[PDB]
Each structure stands twice: as structure tokens, then as C-alpha cells.
Paper text:
Notably, [name] has been shown to carry phospholipase activity with broad substrate specificity which relies on an essential catalytic dyad (Ser142/Asp344), as is the case for other phospholipases. It is encoded on a pathogenicity island together with its cognate chaperone [name], which is required for [name]'s efficient secretion from the bacterial cytoplasm.
The structure of the [name](30–687)∶[name](1–127) complex was solved to a resolution of 2.94 Å by performing a SAD experiment on the selenium edge at the ESRF synchrotron in Grenoble, and harbors a 1∶1 complex in the asymmetric unit. One involves the extremity of the 5-stranded β-sheet, which binds a short β-strand located at the N-terminus of [name] (residues 62–64), thus generating a 6-stranded sheet. A triple glycine sequence (Gly111, 112, 113), in close proximity, provides its backbone atoms as an oxyanion hole that potentially stabilizes the charge of the transition state intermediate in the phospholipase reaction. Our structure reveals that the C-terminus of [name] forms a distinct domain (encompassing residues 588–687) that folds into a 4-helical bundle. Interestingly, residues 679, 682, and 683 form a polar, mostly basic ‘backbone’ that could bind to negatively charged eukaryotic phospholipids, and facilitate lipid bilayer recognition. In summary, the structure of [name] presented here reveals the toxin in its chaperone-bound, inactive, pre-secretion conformation.
Numbering used by the authors:
A (entry chain A), B (entry chain A): 1 to 121
C (entry chain B), D (entry chain B): 28 to 33, 54 to 178, 202 to 328, 346 to 377, 411 to 426, 445 to 531, 535 to 661, 672 to 685
Amino acid sequence: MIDTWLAQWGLRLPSSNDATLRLQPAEGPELVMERLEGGWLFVVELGLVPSGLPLGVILQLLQVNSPFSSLAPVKLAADDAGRLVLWAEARDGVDDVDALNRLHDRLREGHSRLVPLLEPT
Amino acid sequence: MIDTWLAQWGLRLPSSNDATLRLQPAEGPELVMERLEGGWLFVVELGLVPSGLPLGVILQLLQVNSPFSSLAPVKLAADDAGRLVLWAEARDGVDDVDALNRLHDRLREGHSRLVPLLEPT
Amino acid sequence: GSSLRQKLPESVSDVRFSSPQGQGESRTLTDSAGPRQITLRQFENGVTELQLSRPPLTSLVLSGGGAKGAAYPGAMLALEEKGMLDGIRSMSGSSAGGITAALLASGMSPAAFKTLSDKMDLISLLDSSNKIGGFSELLLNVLPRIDSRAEPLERLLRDETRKAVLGQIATHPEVARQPTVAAIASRLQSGSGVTFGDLDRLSAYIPQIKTLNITGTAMFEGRPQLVVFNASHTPDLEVAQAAHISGSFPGVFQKVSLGVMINVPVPEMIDKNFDSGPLRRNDNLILEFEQLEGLEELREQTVVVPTMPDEIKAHLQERLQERVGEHLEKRLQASERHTFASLDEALLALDDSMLTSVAQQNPEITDGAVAFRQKARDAFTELTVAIVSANGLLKLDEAMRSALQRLDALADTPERLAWLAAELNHADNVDHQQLLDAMRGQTVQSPVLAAALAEAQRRKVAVIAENIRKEVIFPSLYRPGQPDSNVALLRRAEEQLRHATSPAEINQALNDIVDNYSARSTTVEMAKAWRNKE
Amino acid sequence: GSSLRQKLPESVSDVRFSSPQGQGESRTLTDSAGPRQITLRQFENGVTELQLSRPPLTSLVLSGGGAKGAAYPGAMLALEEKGMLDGIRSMSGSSAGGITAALLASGMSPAAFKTLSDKMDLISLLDSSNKIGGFSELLLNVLPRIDSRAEPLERLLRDETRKAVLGQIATHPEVARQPTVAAIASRLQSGSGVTFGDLDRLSAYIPQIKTLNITGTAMFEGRPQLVVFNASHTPDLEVAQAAHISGSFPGVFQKVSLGVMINVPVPEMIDKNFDSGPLRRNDNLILEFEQLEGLEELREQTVVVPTMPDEIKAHLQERLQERVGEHLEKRLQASERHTFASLDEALLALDDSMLTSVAQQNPEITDGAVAFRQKARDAFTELTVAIVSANGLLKLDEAMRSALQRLDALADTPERLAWLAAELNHADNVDHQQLLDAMRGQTVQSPVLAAALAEAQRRKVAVIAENIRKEVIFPSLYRPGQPDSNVALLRRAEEQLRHATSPAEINQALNDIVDNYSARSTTVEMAKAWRNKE
């Protein structure tokens, strides 16, 4: 069902597929998708967490994770290298084309909203 | 299946049940459980986000949300009042006693780990 | 402190419900007792559940906007039709409904009001064919200065109001004879307008005169400000003047030297009050256009009506009539539930009347509670005789000590000590307040007095906080340009302030703001100013 | 910049794979070409996939700990048994294996080594019956001072090594006659120990002499420090001295004035090198006890063996023999895959040999690439003749210009310009480096030279970063008391440093640390010191 999500850009999931694929759309963030046990992990990168963020910004960051946020189920986190990341988790079975299309959009929405909060710091 | 999770403390889900139940165990954090469409939301409170956190602390906060964290699937967020919260989402059907027991423990583990990071600030 | 939104696991030992929750079968201690239908259920584990009829309708909140206040007499009829207009004791309106509640508080009968609105729906539409401290006392001080005395609207209102009030005075010639009233109606006949001070003063005598609260939100410096006209802040200012001022859409600041926005958010009109217990003292009928009193509980009390001719305006006075008709009977079949951890806690939540009702019906249940209430009401008088006879000559004489001893004896559980302190805090009770003001900051032998004093300081602190919310936060929070980051910070300062119990915590609120607000100056100044003053 | 761990939706228009990925059917351009079995597959959309045999085994990394280095000769046999001991050119060991690789680099044959380890497994166990800059040059300067010259271990190693090296010299009397060698063996026979400088110098002549790298981690001030003994940092220091020093479990700091920890983390021994392309130049056999070279790729190259008698030690020399036997044949049936965006990119990734192999087999594919390679190799000599004859008398004469012109002409795609710059950066190539050092900071007519110069500064910057990682981060990161908050900060500084391309970015790394590290002083000082120096 991922392969038919791909299909709509005339891309096909590459044979001998290993860990990480990376999609770069014509506008906006690159999409990194690792592969899991029974699902793919979509992720969008926002840069290394900046030093000296103001409280309000910290808050707006944390608030992205309320179970009620407009971006659900996308989550905001940092990886072990301190890189600020939005991610979601697409399962095989459960999810499908329309649903993956949603994840993707919520990731881009999250990325555009936040990305100016860091840079100007 | 929630009612049998309760049952093990000789508590029973109260009749005329409305929005929010609150469990206070003999040691450790109070557990707030709202009720949803088809599931309950467990939540643990950590206080209002402090002003002037150091970067490393911010980082350790964000890192709680990596899909690979030892606390998964518990998430860290702030509510609209700026209150720092750990939460998980228990669905009807899917989850059961052993599983709810896990959520709970991961919440308490998260709460003890982090709670000293804020106070001393 | 609640959350607002809009590998083997090692065991957790034994866990209770942090709130009280009935467990097991319930017996019913008292079924439908009294006018307010008191029901007490009690459970195997002690927890007592109270169920009780919705509080008395004592208030009318009228939201502004548009010109559509030709629908308004729909409700007015619906009120006297079902006959609960008498029962109203307060009226509160903003913007366009700000005028309307003026008229009504003034005492204008239901039928009287309509004919006026049928020559008003011209005027209300022709005025749309026309169209330290804060921005509150600098209004409160700019009024007597360079403002054109009486316009077509000021005159018309001045007279409408003056007719109603003077008319009621006569229908009730038992009050007319009382000095203070006859002082007010000789003012009115001299050409003076009705003030709040007297609308108030008259509502104590005659029940068809209502109090008035007109709220309004003025932009200054892009920053909306709350402004209130009521009996307490602007007592002698004229009702007419204000209702017109708050007719001003966005209004000029004379340039004096040193959802949308027209809405005053509903809850900024409804009053903060310190009820002795978990029981709400009244209900609101909230008419809208298009003990944290929540969204959900406010929805329940809000009915929301869906170049103007004269027959479509009738239609609107029928649609309203009818919704405000179904509501009022429905509201009559709905309830309030309160859960307590013990019988005595729930008998404490009842006023003496309600108590007395439960007592009539099931005296076995209440004898203890009536015993306690009787002795408290006695000790509280006994204490008042002391305070007063001491003014005869500050110093707690023996007689106060004795009564404080009698009160201390009644506080044999933490629940009752809390009740006894709150009772002694009634702002309305001049003599008790006389004593708390005096022992302020002092260490006292009596536990009850020690509670009461602590309770007093908590309240002092809460009004300070509320003042700051209204004048440092509210303006920034609803600045149109406000980036969400900034909003997050203040929505948090609000939270801090809500829970503030000591001046020190209040200081910290403001510092969080100074330290973390990006001018992306004034809010920050404003805060600095609050932080340094006592 | 990768991620490390351990309502209708409006459309997204057209989206490619950011990396190259084969789409559609593949043809095979060249099957198994050469010793390294080069396979090229090419896809409908251009993307060329390279598959190639694992690189040559040229390195042996020996991890320390325990005393269990009586298993070690298991492998040593397994190596000469399958006959790839010749092929080794480097040996790297820490702690307990630090001694072992000394012995072996010295040139001690497989059988020779064993008998020694059977009088060594007494000694290795009896030594357990016994038991600005940094902490590296203050070791490097504390050696000649107040340290007891030669112990039982120093002597025994001094001689073992001196026998092997001197023995090989003779078996190869063609080299013995060469001045520099005969200079070294007259030193050795005089009583001197083998240094790194010469272990190195001898590995160029004889292939049974190997280079040596001994790593070790010394606690100072609770803060572990990396310390390296190799041909480049400690060239004339004796191999014996070091292997003993790094025998010191935790070792005394003489008190000179101004998983667990004994492990030097594997990757701190394996060498950072700048390969002209995406191809790894060699493989490691990593023996362990109990182009970011990842965990996963390091696992693939690591075989991990599972009062000592003399027969159980044999058992261990059999278990090892056998695992290090299956590995070596398996490793022979595994591959490397590299994906490129064009044929020419993948022909660029091949060294001249490999290129020549593909050429033999399928000349239609490569003629262009061989044409280009030939002209580059010509132009690079032509340029070297220029540089050298200019020393005859800095100033780019015409002859260099001409060759830089010839190179500029070959760089007709961004891929080849990159290749041409890297080629001109070979640290090993004294004459090219002579020129880059001279045009440092200068603006030059030639694009290739402009690339090469930029590439040079990138590298300069990377070694600085690597130096800082090793001496500001590494010590703090693995301080035992370190709260996770602090670890997060530094794991991030590492990330910053890894990707640092300019001095300014390096400065920012360090500031992030100064500004945000809670002494919960020294790391911060350390950083301050790096930040001010050029």
C-alpha cells in the first residue's frame, strides 16, 4: 500500500530496498522514511535545537504533542544528535494512500510553522 | 477491560461516570484519566514549564519523544496552560490489563526521571 | 492542578480515587426536599452525592454586536410570559445590548419596551447610519472634561430610564415615603439621569428595578482594554452616558496625553464571587448573536438566537420568544450534582433554608448539622455584639475571646473549620471585616480566627491576581498581531495567576513575563509596574 | 543531514528520490571484472549500481581487557593458515592486546609467537599477580624524565621484537644492503629497542613487518583521556615502552604539576582517512573480548571470541582458529554495493587498476573514462615538473598555468571537477601540497585549483574538529558521573563538529558548550582555550 502511495509520482519502491529512502518534493522539506518491523517511519528534519530559545517558543514546541493538536498524530522530538524532528509512523495494514497523504501534509504543515521559530534565533 | 484493570485495587469504575477520574497510588504521581471516543487517556502532571531551562535539559525533554525511547508510547507535551505532561492513550479493544499496567509504569518512570530536572531550576 | 486542553512491570501497591467517588450500593437519605428539590444519596464507603435543582435565575447577560437588538423583546416577553422577570436581580450587557439592558434595568415593563424598540430599531439603525491604573480611571476621569453633554441617544435613554424608575416608585407608594427614595426621585424630576448607584439602591426596595453592568472593550495602542460601568466602579455616573459610550464601535480616545474582536468574551461579564461552598448561587440567561465556570457549564446557560422592515423584526421577536420559552421549561427539568466525602460535608454545602428543608423531611439525618448551625449562628451574633460594644470605646477584650472560644469549639473537623472561616469572611458583614482587618498579620490564640485570617489573605491575593489578569494579560493576549509563541507565554501567566496563593507567587508570574516576552515594550513595562507596587 | 537514533490534504506536486535509486529494468554493463569482481548494473533512468568484492584485509585491530590474550594465537594461525598474514599492513591494539600486536608487528612468525605465549600466559597473568595540548604530549614529555628504564616486561618485549625484526632483515638480504636498513639493524644490535619509526620504515621493504598503533585510555581528574602511540605521534619512542605503559590498567600520573571503561571504544582505533571517493580502501579484522563507519558495518568486520592451565588455553587457540576461519571464507563471498547517478560517476569511483579491469572486459563502456584518466594522469605529472623546476629558482610561472589549463579542460562536469580537486589533495604528494600551501587564501584563475584549495581548507577544518572531539568532548562524554542532560549537550556538539565546514561553525560548537554546560568548570575552560587559538 506504500508502493501505491509512491506510484502516484511515477516512482516505485526500489528493488533490493534497504534502510532509508529519501523523497524530495518540488516544494518544501525532504521526507526521510526508514523501514520498520511492520511499517514505515516518516520523518522531517528541522535542524539542531538552538541554544537560548525563549520560554514561549519552548512552549509552542511542547504544545505540538498534545493529543489534541491540529497536527496529530505527528510528533515532535529530538534525535540523539540533538536534531529537532517531526515524525509519524505509518503501519502496514492499517494505513493507506489517503492516510499517508495526510501524514505527509501534517509533516509539511508542522515544518513550515516551526521552521521560522528557530532560524531567527 | 478498563474495569478489570481497576478491579485489581478493589476499585470499580463509578456509575454515572463523567469526564475525568483521578487515581492516587500509595507512592508516586496522581494519574488523571479522561475519557474519549473509544478509549481512555492517561496523563501525569509534571508542573508548569520553568523559565530559563538549559539546552541539555530541553534536549532530554525532546528526546523522550523519539519513536525509539525507552518510554514508548508515552509522550511528553505541554497543555494550553503551559503545564508539562506525560501522557498515553489507552484504546478499548486493543489494550488490556497487562498493557495498561505497562502504560502506567512508563508514566511513573518518566515522572521520576524528569521531575528532578525542573525543580532544581 | 488539572490539565487544560481544547520487561515485567513492577506493581503499584494500593490506589484510591483522589476525588470522592461512590462505590457500592446507595441508600437515599432524603428524596426531593424543598423548593430546590434536594436529593442526598449515600454510598457504602461514605461518599454522599447531592442532587439539586438548577439555581435561581437571577441574572441576564446581553451580548452586543450588529444592530439586531430588535429581536431582544422576544426574550423580554418570554420572561414575563413564564413569569421570572420578577426573579431577575441583575443585568449585564456589552456593545449593542449595552443600551438594551439599561432600558430594562430602569424598570421598563415588557410591553412598554416593545413600542420603544419599534421607534428604536429606526434609531439603533440610524446610529449605524451615523456610523498605574489603566484605560479605565483615565476614562473615569475624562468624562467630566470635554465631552458633549447630551445627544439624541443620551436624551432618549435619559428619559426612558427616568420614566420607568419614577413610574415604579409610584406603583409602590410604601417605598416612595422613605427618605432615601424620595431623595432620588426629587433628583430625577429635577432633570438628572438615573445612575448605577440608585438603580442599585432601588432594586433593594422594588423587585422590578434591576442592577446594571455594562461592559465594553476599547482599543488603545492596538491593545484592547476592558472597561466596566457598574454600581461599584462608576456609581454616580449616569446609566445613559455609559450605554452610549459603549455604543461606540471602536471609539476615539480624544487623544488625551500622559470569532472576532467586538466581542467582550462572555466570562468577562459574569461575576467572580466567593461562595462559602461548592454551590453556585445563581444562574445566567446568556443571549448571544451571530468554581471555574467552564465553557461547558456556560454553553448550558446560553441561548443563541439565529435596513430592517417592521414585520421581519416581529418574526425575530417570535423565534426568540419561542427558544427562550423551551429553555426556561427545560432548565426547570435539569439538575446539579455534587459529590462529597461525607454526609456532614454535604450538609455544610447547604444554606440554612436548604438545611431546614432536609430537616423537615428527614430529621434523623440532620439533627447534628442543625445543632451545629444553630450554635454557629448564635456564636456569630455573640461575637458581633462584642465587636460593636468595643467600639463603645482593636484590642480583643474578653467577650470576643469568649465567642471565639465558642466558635473554636464547633470546629471539630477540618471541614467545619473551613466553613467557619469562610462564614467569617463575608465581605458584606462590616463588623466581622472590622475584626479581620485589625488582626491582619497577627498571631492569634483562636484557631478559627487563625483560619479566617489566612482565608482573608488568600482572597486579598486573588483580587490582585484578577486585576493583573485584566490589565497586563488580557490586552496582550488579544492583541491581533500576537505570535502564538507570545500567546503561549501569557496563557501560562494566566495559569500561574489563577493558582497564586501568595504575593511571592504573584511576583514570579510577572517575572516569567519580563524575562521571556519578545517585543516581536509596553506589556513588560506594565508588568514591571505591578511588580514594584504593594 | 541524517537522523541518528539507537479536511482534504492539498497535493504535493512532483517528487524525486533525493538519493539515486534504480528505476526500471537493468542491463549489466560488466559482470565480474578483475580481482575485485567489479559488477556494473545500469538502469532505465541512468542510475548505475556498482557491486564489488570486500576490500583487501590490510588491518588488525586488537581489543584489550582481561588477561585472556592466550587465545590470540588462535587467530594468528588462522591467518597464515589461510595465508593472508602477508596481506596485513597494520596492527592496532589497546590495553592487553596492546602488547600482543607489538610482538606481531615486530615480525614474529605464527609458530614463533605461540611458544612465547605459553611462557607469556604465565607472565601476562603474573603481571595480574602484580596487579593547550593535553594528557598526550605531557606524557610524550614525561617519558624521558623519571621513569624506571627497563622492567621484566620491557626487557622481554625489547628482545622478542628485536629478534623478529633482525631475523626478517636477514631472510631478505636484498634489503639488508640498503643504507637506511643497515642503519636500523646496527642500532638494534647495539641494544636499542624497535621504535614505531622503523617498524614503519621496514614495512615498506619487507611485508612480514607491520606498522603498530597502540591506543589506551588514561583517567585524569575522573576524566578519561585518549592516548596514542603510533608512527606519527611517537615515532622514536620504543614499541616496548608503550605496550607496557598501556599495560597499566588505570595508571599513575606521577603527580606531575601544571559496557565498561577499560574499553577504548572500537572506532577510536580505526583510522580516519580521506579517500578520493565513496570506496573504502581496506577492511578490518576486529577481535573483541567479553563515510561514517557505522555500528552495522563494524559489526560485519568484528569477530568476537567467547589462574589458567595449559590445555584450556589450547581449547581457546582452537575456538578462535575456527571462527576466524569461517569468517575469512565467508567475508570472501560477501560484497559492497554503491549506487551512483551516472556511469561516469561510478567509473570515477574506481582506482586506475579497477578501471583498467573493467576496460579489458568491456572497452566500449570505459573508453571515455580511460581517455579522461590518461589525460589527468599526464597533466598531473606535467604540473609536477613545473612545481619542481620552479624550485630551481611561489610564483605561478607559465608552465604551471599551462598544466592547470589542461586540468581545467578535463573538468567538464561537476563530478570530475570534484575528482580532480581530491586528486590534487593527496597529503602523500609533497609537490602538489607545496602548491596548495602557497596559494592558500588566494583567488586563482584556474577552477581546478580553486576547487582544490577549497577542498584543502575543508580538510584543515575537519582535523581541527576531530582534535576537539577527542579532547574536549570525549573526556566529558565518558565521565562516569555525567548526568544525561550533560551527555545530550555534548552528543550534540559532536554533531555540530562532524558537519563543521568553516572555522566559524567550529567556534559556534564550542560556544554552545560554554553557554549551556552545567558544572553539576574544566570542560568549559578547555573549550574556551580552543575557541581563542588559531
